[PDB]
Design a protein around this ligand. Structure first.
Ligand SMILES: OC[C@H]1O[C@H](O[C@@H]2[C@H](O)[C@@H](O)O[C@H](CO)[C@H]2O)[C@@H](O)[C@@H](O)[C@@H]1O
Ligand SMILES: [Ca+2]
Ligand SMILES: [Ca+2]
Ligand SMILES: [Mn+2]
Ligand SMILES: [Mn+2]
Lengths: 240, 240
């Protein structure tokens, strides 16, 4: 289809169109990307992702068209630790994408250690909300929590300072306009605090015509819950 | 998802979210539900169906919600004969639906012979565009071409006299309103000729909570092409 849209105001346990990978599962009408114990507390060494089952037609060679898409979602992070890790990311990748071996912790379940910073070995666009930036282990990160745009590498093409707020939901709107090729990110907390970051990228040179969209999160030695609370997505092919 | 929508203005060969069953295949940017030869002419004894891959949440027992839905599509029928058969149908059924054994010809690839008129043995709602009504083989049909609403039986609960026009595209709008429980069908030819038929039905007592939507067509001894040209669908769970 040239156009596709779906909306999850909440996430009931009875799901049919979500692909669950790793430890991801539904609990209390939300998606818990990372594993939690019986008490609902976060644990270390966990990775989880979800993808919508239907494939999205991002661009089309034959017609020279590229999709205009928007993804709106909200999530919250919670941890008793002073340095909860590692973060959650909205991502777009080839349909057959699976969790790479050793992609835990700072690699957010998106990259393999051997090629995490090799842009020629990956096919992924992701918007990360990264809460762990220890310069000794996450050497590629700026020294502070941040929102980053990742294009084929865990080393973001761009980041902006972000404030992690325990237990508070962050609403995010990610849009891509094929005419300007701008990928825009706008995130806000309920008190009006806003973060904005944009990057110009030709998705046709990074991803295949058909892709899947979803979320990924991980926790290494430090941990926190990564709770996806709602998600709506729409995409339509436009001539450009 | 509480809401889902998709649109196929045309049907390029590169399809990823369609389930093809029987003889259905893409040719010339359209879906040919029934088999055709090299010259492109229709052949006898063929059945074909397509279903969208993502499951639709038609109703939710826990929240007591039922979805409204709208399906818009266009198709054309062509045949060297004047008695083209058998017809095409838009249908909604359980996700694991497959072509029943011996469902060719007048059964439109939707029902099994032994239970075609047994409402207690079926789970399907369909809107048929029936062009063949010979009483020797299609005993359940009115004696004229027609559009009908089928609820668990090949014998339509409601029909309207219809005119088959070789090679002309028929635009159809099918809508279900959970508030009134009315399934409405409006079909029009380009010159404005219009046909309408509606029926009140509680989808909750006929189908499971999750379903798949698609089209089916068949040709027995008499034949014609059943070309699906475009298709858009939208569904949203409502409280009412
Ligand atoms: O495709 C039309 C029709 O074909 C087959 O039935 C035949 C027709 O009723 C007509 O041609 O007369 C034949 C002789 O009695 C009869 O077989 C079946 O496949 C039927 O299901 C289909 O509708
Ligand atoms: Ca990090
Ligand atoms: Ca018939
Ligand atoms: Mn980072
Ligand atoms: Mn009929």
């Amino acid at each position: 289809q040239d156009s596709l849209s779906f909306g999850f105001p909440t996430f009931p346990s009875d799901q049919k169109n979500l692909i669950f990978q790793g430890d991801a599962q539904i609990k209390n009408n939300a998606v818990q990307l990372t594993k939690t114990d019986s008490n609902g507390n976060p644990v270390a060494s966990t990775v989880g992702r979800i993808l919508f089952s239907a494939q999205v037609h991002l661009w089309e060679k034959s017609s020279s068209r590229v999709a205009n898409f928007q993804s709106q979602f909200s999530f919250s992070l919670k941890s008793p630790l002073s340095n909860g890790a590692d973060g959650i990311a909205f991502f777009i990748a080839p349909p057959d994408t699976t969790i790479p071996s050793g992609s835990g912790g700072g690699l957010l379940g998106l990259f393999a250690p051997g090629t995490a910073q090799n842009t020629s070995a990956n096919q992924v666009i992701a918007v990360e909300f990264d809460t762990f930036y220890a310069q000794d282990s996450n050497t590629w990160d700026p020294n502070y929590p941040h929102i980053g745009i990742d294009v084929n590498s865990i080393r973001s093409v761009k980041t902006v300072k972000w404030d992690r707020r325990d237990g508070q939901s962050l609403n995010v709107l990610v849009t891509f306009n094929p005419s300007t090729r701008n990928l825009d990110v706008v995130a806000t907390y309920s008190d009006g605090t806003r973060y904005e970051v944009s990057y110009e990228v030709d998705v046709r040179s990074v991803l295949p015509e058909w892709v899947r969209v979803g979320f990924s999160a991980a926790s290494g030695e430090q941990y926190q819950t990564h709770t996806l609370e709602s998600w709506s997505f729409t995409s339509t092919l436009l001539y450009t």
